[PDB]
Amino acid sequence: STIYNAVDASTLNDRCRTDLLDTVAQLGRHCETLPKKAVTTADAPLPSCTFNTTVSRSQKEINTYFKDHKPKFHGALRTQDCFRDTRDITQLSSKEKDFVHRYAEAKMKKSIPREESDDVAKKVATEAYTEAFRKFKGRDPTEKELLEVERLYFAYADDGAVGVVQKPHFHGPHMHVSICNRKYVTCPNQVYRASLPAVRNARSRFPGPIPVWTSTKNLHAVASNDTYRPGVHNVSKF
Amino acid sequence: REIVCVQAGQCGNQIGSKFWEVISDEHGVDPTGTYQGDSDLQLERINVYFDEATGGRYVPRSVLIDLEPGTMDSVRAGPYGQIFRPDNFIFGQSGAGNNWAKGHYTEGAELIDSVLDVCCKEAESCDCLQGFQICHSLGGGTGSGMGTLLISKLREQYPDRIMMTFSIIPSPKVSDTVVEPYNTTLSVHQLVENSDESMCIDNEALYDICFRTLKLTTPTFGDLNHLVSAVVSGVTCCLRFPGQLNSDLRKLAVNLVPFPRLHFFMMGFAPLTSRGSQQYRGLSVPELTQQMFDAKNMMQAADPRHGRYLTASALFRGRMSTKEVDEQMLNVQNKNSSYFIEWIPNNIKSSVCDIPPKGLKMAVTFIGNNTCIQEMFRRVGEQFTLMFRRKAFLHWYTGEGMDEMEFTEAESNMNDLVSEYQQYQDATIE
Amino acid sequence: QILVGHTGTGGMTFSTFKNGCFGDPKGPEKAGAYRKRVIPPTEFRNYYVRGDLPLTIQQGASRTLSWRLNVSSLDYHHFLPIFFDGLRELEEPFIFVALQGCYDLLERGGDKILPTIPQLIVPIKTALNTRHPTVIINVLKVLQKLVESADFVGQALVPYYRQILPVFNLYKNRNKNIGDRIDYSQTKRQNISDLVNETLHLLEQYGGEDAYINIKYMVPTYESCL
Amino acid sequence: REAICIHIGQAGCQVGNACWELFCLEHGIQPDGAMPSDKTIGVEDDAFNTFFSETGAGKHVPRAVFLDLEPTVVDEVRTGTYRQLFHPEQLISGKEDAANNYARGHYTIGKEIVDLCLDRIRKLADNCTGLQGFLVYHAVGGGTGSGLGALLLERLSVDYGKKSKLGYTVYPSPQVSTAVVEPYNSVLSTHSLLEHTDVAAMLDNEAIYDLTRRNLDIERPTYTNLNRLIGQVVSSLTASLRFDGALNVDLTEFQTNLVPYPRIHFVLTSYAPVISAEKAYHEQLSVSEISNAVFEPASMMTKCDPRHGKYMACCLMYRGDVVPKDVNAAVATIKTKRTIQFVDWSPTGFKCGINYQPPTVVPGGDLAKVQRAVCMIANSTAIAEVFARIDHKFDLMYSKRAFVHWYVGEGMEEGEFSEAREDLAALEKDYEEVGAESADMD
Numbered sequence A: 001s002t003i004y005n006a007v008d009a010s011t012l013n014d015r016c017r018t019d020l021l022d023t024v025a026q027l028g029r030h031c032e033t034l035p036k037k038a039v040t041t042a043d044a045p046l047p048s049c050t051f052n053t054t055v056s057r058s059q060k061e062i063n064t065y066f067k068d069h070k071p072k073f074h075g076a077l078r079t080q081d082c083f084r085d086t087r088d089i090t091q092l093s094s095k096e097k098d099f100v101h102r103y104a105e106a107k108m109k110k111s112i113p114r115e116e117s118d119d120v121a122k123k124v125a126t127e128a129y130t131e132a133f134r135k136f137k138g139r140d141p142t143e144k145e146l147l148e149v150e151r152l153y154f155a156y157a158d159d160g161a162v163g164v165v166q167k168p169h170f171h172g173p174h175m176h177v178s179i180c181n182r183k184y185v186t187c188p189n190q191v192y193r194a195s196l197p198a199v200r201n202a203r204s205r206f207p208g209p210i211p212v213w214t215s216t217k218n219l220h221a222v223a224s225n226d227t228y229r230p231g232v233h234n235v236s237k238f
Numbered sequence B: 001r002e003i004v005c006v007q008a009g010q011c012g013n014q015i016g017s018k019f020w021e022v023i024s025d026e027h028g029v030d031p032t033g034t035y036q037g038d039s040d041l042q043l044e045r046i047n048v049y050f051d052e053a054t055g056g057r058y059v060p061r062s063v064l065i066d067l068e069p070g071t072m073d074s075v076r077a078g079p080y081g082q083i084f085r086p087d088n089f090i091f092g093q094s095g096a097g098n099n100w101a102k103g104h105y106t107e108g109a110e111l112i113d114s115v116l117d118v119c120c121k122e123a124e125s126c127d128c129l130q131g132f133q134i135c136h137s138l139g140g141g142t143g144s145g146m147g148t149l150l151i152s153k154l155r156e157q158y159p160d161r162i163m164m165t166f167s168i169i170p171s172p173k174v175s176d177t178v179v180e181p182y183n184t185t186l187s188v189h190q191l192v193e194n195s196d197e198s199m200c201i202d203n204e205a206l207y208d209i210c211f212r213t214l215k216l217t218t219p220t221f222g223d224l225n226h227l228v229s230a231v232v233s234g235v236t237c238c239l240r241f242p243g244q245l246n247s248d249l250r251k252l253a254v255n256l257v258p259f260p261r262l263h264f265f266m267m268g269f270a271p272l273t274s275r276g277s278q279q280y281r282g283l284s285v286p287e288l289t290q291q292m293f294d295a296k297n298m299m300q301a302a303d304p305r306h307g308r309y310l311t312a313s314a315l316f317r318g319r320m321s322t323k324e325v326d327e328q329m330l331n332v333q334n335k336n337s338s339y340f341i342e343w344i345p346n347n348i349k350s351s352v353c354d355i356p357p358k359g360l361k362m363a364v365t366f367i368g369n370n371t372c373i374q375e376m377f378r379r380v381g382e383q384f385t386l387m388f389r390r391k392a393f394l395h396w397y398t399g400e401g402m403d404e405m406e407f408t409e410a411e412s413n414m415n416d417l418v419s420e421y422q423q424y425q426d427a428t429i430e
Numbered sequence C: 001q002i003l004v005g006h007t008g009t010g011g012m013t014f015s016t017f018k019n020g021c022f023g024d025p026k027g028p029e030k031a032g033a034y035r036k037r038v039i040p041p042t043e044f045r046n047y048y049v050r051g052d053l054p055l056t057i058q059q060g061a062s063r064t065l066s067w068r069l070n071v072s073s074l075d076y077h078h079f080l081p082i083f084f085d086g087l088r089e090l091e092e093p094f095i096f097v098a099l100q101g102c103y104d105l106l107e108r109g110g111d112k113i114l115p116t117i118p119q120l121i122v123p124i125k126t127a128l129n130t131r132h133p134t135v136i137i138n139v140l141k142v143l144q145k146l147v148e149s150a151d152f153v154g155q156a157l158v159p160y161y162r163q164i165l166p167v168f169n170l171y172k173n174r175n176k177n178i179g180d181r182i183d184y185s186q187t188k189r190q191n192i193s194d195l196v197n198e199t200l201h202l203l204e205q206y207g208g209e210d211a212y213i214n215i216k217y218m219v220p221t222y223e224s225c226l
Numbered sequence D: 001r002e003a004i005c006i007h008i009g010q011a012g013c014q015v016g017n018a019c020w021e022l023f024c025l026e027h028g029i030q031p032d033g034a035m036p037s038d039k040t041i042g043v044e045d046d047a048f049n050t051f052f053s054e055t056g057a058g059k060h061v062p063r064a065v066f067l068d069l070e071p072t073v074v075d076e077v078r079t080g081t082y083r084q085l086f087h088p089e090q091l092i093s094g095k096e097d098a099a100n101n102y103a104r105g106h107y108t109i110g111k112e113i114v115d116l117c118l119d120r121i122r123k124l125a126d127n128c129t130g131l132q133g134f135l136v137y138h139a140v141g142g143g144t145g146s147g148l149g150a151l152l153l154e155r156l157s158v159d160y161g162k163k164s165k166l167g168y169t170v171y172p173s174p175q176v177s178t179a180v181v182e183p184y185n186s187v188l189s190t191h192s193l194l195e196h197t198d199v200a201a202m203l204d205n206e207a208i209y210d211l212t213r214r215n216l217d218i219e220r221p222t223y224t225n226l227n228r229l230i231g232q233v234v235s236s237l238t239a240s241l242r243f244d245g246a247l248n249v250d251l252t253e254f255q256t257n258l259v260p261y262p263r264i265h266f267v268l269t270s271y272a273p274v275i276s277a278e279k280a281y282h283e284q285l286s287v288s289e290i291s292n293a294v295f296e297p298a299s300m301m302t303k304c305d306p307r308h309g310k311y312m313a314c315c316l317m318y319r320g321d322v323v324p325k326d327v328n329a330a331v332a333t334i335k336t337k338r339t340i341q342f343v344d345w346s347p348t349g350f351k352c353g354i355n356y357q358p359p360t361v362v363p364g365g366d367l368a369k370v371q372r373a374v375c376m377i378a379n380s381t382a383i384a385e386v387f388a389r390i391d392h393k394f395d396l397m398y399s400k401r402a403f404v405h406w407y408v409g410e411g412m413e414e415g416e417f418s419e420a421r422e423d424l425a426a427l428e429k430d431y432e433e434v435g436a437e438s439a440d441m442d
């Protein structure tokens, strides 16, 4: 039964009929405009004996509908950071870069001048660090003591001050627990942008879909067989 | 409010035999057909699945169909087989050969009128008819072709009722037949047009349920069909017993399907645990909810963590507080909030029923609408594309008479279904 | 027929989409008793072609019939059934010869018409079964002439009402109602039902003392005229 | 349900004798055709129906014809132990052989006998209600087996049409040989088997000799051992029709799953627990071990090595006490192997069957008694190597026209040699092309 015949035989009024048909048409159009993979086709140079037919089998044969809505709320909390947008998770951390430079210095057995760049974040962080160092001790900090800027993490406050996040949180979902348990996708202590980590399939775990029943020395146990395939896990640090 | 069941092919007949065992146990029907129950609550809705024969007897409102009688001797040999009405068995004289075109066109059109006549005779006897329930495999031959044929005829004849299907689909690993991709693709093409709501099951997930959760040493197809009979008999429980918050198949459909193509659902049933472990853990609503969302207890290979929930429904059986149900569904929605589609403010429906299955204090059945079902279809389409490019076995279908255009249409329709699910799986950048 | 995508009613179920008999609703096929039947071949054709009939068509100014032998001396036992068998014909020149022959044999038959009554029953009953209006009109006029031809003829036809009257029942109540309009078919006597009623009245009139019972037995609607 | 067996010539009749010995002993029919009253089979049971019909007095008679041109072997059957079992009309014999000439059998002598064969086969087919194919046993090396087998398959294919025809064929061994003219008869034979068979199973006597020397402990084998092995294989394949099981396999499923293209119908066959009683008690016999056995080339009943080609489809029949988990684990282990390769267009390479009836053991010292067995039929491109050795022997002989005057004298054109050799060459090219990887997307 086709939808058009069902609507024609239905007992609606005209307006509901045309609304229903137009909704179906717009859904079909949106399905058409959504780009994923195309239909398959046969190859051009197929060999022989794919069209030839044996005489026995010859006797066998019988012969915009969707709308965007972003209602802002007045006084909503800040959910982005200027320092956070500069960092990238895939690249190695700043502490790791500092260790790489110290590794190079130790290998060459001589001091190596640091690279110089005109990033605004580095300038702001060095300014704040120098101010705090002069506050705590009545001296200007030495260039060797300015190397702590690379190791630490920095972020703005709500009133515009510059500070250090002492204990960063995981960039994925995690739990801030109090008198009530609550999960936070994003929190001000995160040092990277929020993202969802990837997980393995639940049915490709250590035992395969069909395990084999074996035994220990004197208890029953389980073991895997060829239905279980370990992951590739081809990755290395640095 | 009576449901009519259709059971097709060997897998369907076996699952049906286990279903009617579970239902007769829950309603206290003797294998002679005599009522032997111990509360009026059992009797007052017996009509839902049984018809009353004269002086005591009850007969089950089911049609059994298959193309070769080999299965009939097995179902006739089962523990409840005598109960079935003789006129309700419609069978041929030679098998489907696992070929969709044979099952659909030659013996399908030959038998289908007698099956439609039996289904109409059964439907018009009800005082008010609820939806049909069909069990079949999609990978087979007579199951896929004749099941979808019958579904199309019943949808022509009863367009205002509900059409619900339970369907078995081939594992990528546990193969039993070479031509599985063709039969699966053509059947899914038929279902996505024809069905109102369809649940899909892979035997590999039931095997993993048996081995990991139940720790069975030597599982058999009877255990898998017992798990399936448990969920199928659980979904209808609110139809046929009192409760604090009644529910119905149509209300489930209205809450589960956001758009009419998105009608493919995953299933689970919670209180599964091995006899050695059972002394270690009591039943409770948090425990049932935790097992209910745990993917180990879910009956498909796709994992929810790779998709997103559009909607879900939980039906609880037993004497329990409504506060715990509501607060559990809130807590689960809040704790896993990234896996729920954000433009719907509440994804879970709850329902509460007073009467649990015999010998359990409580039970829940879970229905979930999640975009990860798209992963099964791409895999089937991959194996189809490998087979189709080389015309690997195509001459059988063309010799029966099929145009290649059916194959290209079915491939395009399934690919559009995958695309529609795929857009909703990944959230927008904003 | 094939299933094209994006056209099904999947996921769209509404209560608004609503859509003991031993026979098909169309009923049984009609087997009309008014349908025309085939005309069996007649012996009059053979007798006329061979040349055993002692008559010729005299042309003159208008078509008449001339006899080599005087009519009162012919053998009616032989000749009369063939002429009654010619009433079933439909095409010329057989119909004119048959009709004029039956008329002018009945006109001056004499006292030998009575013994040959049983021989004429089969041609009469086989002419009326054809259900062709022209031969029906002809045989009805022939019967009207026959009944009043001689004495005691009508009383012999009383036992044979069983083989003549079944056709009469079809066309007894079939006159057209034209209200105040005048009917022009009366000039040529081309109406069937009035002929049927007149024949029934004449048959009862000349039948004797028990014709009414038989006519009522075979025509249920009929009521007596005397 | 029913199947009719047609036995042609010497090898086919002797293998038929061994087969019917086995089917009688497995069902329990006495050699007089009756059934003893002390057995617990029951009068009502029907499993025999695949192979026997009753006249109503309860005697059994078998659904077979025995066809030969020489009298001696059928008269041996007539005077043997099963004399009263067969109906005398079923045993058809001519006067004189086809003398290793395909031409003599096909043109001169088989043409006289063939109409009698069709009248008896018709008389069998009229007494059926679910015939689902013909099984044919013959050797292609001899004259009457080749000529009358081809002529009869042609006539059957015209008369019966769509009904399936599955052949078991004894092909000329690659270095063991019995007659000089074997290459000519086998080349001329293969054209008819190509056109007029739905699946063809290839057998070589040298392989069954190797299997009985190597696996069994028999120093002095004879044809009865080979014929008993063949009978066991046929009983394994037809067991799926006759007894209850978890995963049944109808005879149409073999053809549907095993044959990818209508010409690609030549299959390899193997059987797993060919083992002696002393070895059988030295070894456990789990499902996975016998599944691993059917894939070793030492297990095959045709002299070919499948490692030189690629598999397109496999059909695995398990009978006896087997559980689906062992079948699934075995098939997954086979798929894991690196020396087993499938064509990339056949991803789902396997068909499974599971039957509860264990294989029957026939009195004697040729197989152990075992609770379970597996039988394999498989389609592979390696078979092209089997044909190549016959073609080399044909080319050697045909280079000097070594014997052709016999064939031309008995009624055949010289052109038929070149035609047949080119058709079998085309069959090799088909197996070369089908096995070529799909490198069209580059």
Ligand SMILES: Nc1nc2c(ncn2[C@@H]2O[C@H](COP(=O)(O)OP(=O)(O)OP(=O)(O)O)[C@@H](O)[C@H]2O)c(=O)[nH]1
Pocket: D008, D009, D010, D011, D012, D014, D015, D069, D070, D097, D098, D099, D100, D101, D139, D141, D142, D143, D144, D145, D146, D170, D172, D173, D178, D205, D223, D226, D227
């Ligand atoms: N396995 C097996 N092979 C046999 C048997 N008998 C003969 N062969 C082989 O088949 C080939 C001989 O074919 P035959 O059957 O003797 O030829 P034929 O059908 O009798 O043809 P004619 O000689 O013309 O009567 C040789 O390779 C034999 O080794 C047998 O009983 N079993």
Ligand SMILES: Nc1nc2c(ncn2[C@@H]2O[C@H](COP(=O)(O)OP(=O)(O)O)[C@@H](O)[C@H]2O)c(=O)[nH]1
Pocket: B008, B009, B010, B011, B012, B014, B015, B096, B098, B137, B139, B140, B141, B142, B143, B144, B168, B170, B175, B176, B203, B221, B224, B225
């Ligand atoms: N869960 C379950 N699966 C089954 C059963 N019987 C067969 N199967 C599976 O279904 C597929 C075979 O399909 P089948 O039911 O034979 O198709 P049909 O011949 O059309 O009925 C294989 O994957 C089998 O493992 C059963 O009783 N239960």
Ligand SMILES: [Mg+2]
Pocket: D009, D010, D070, D097, D142, D144
């Ligand atoms: Mg011989």
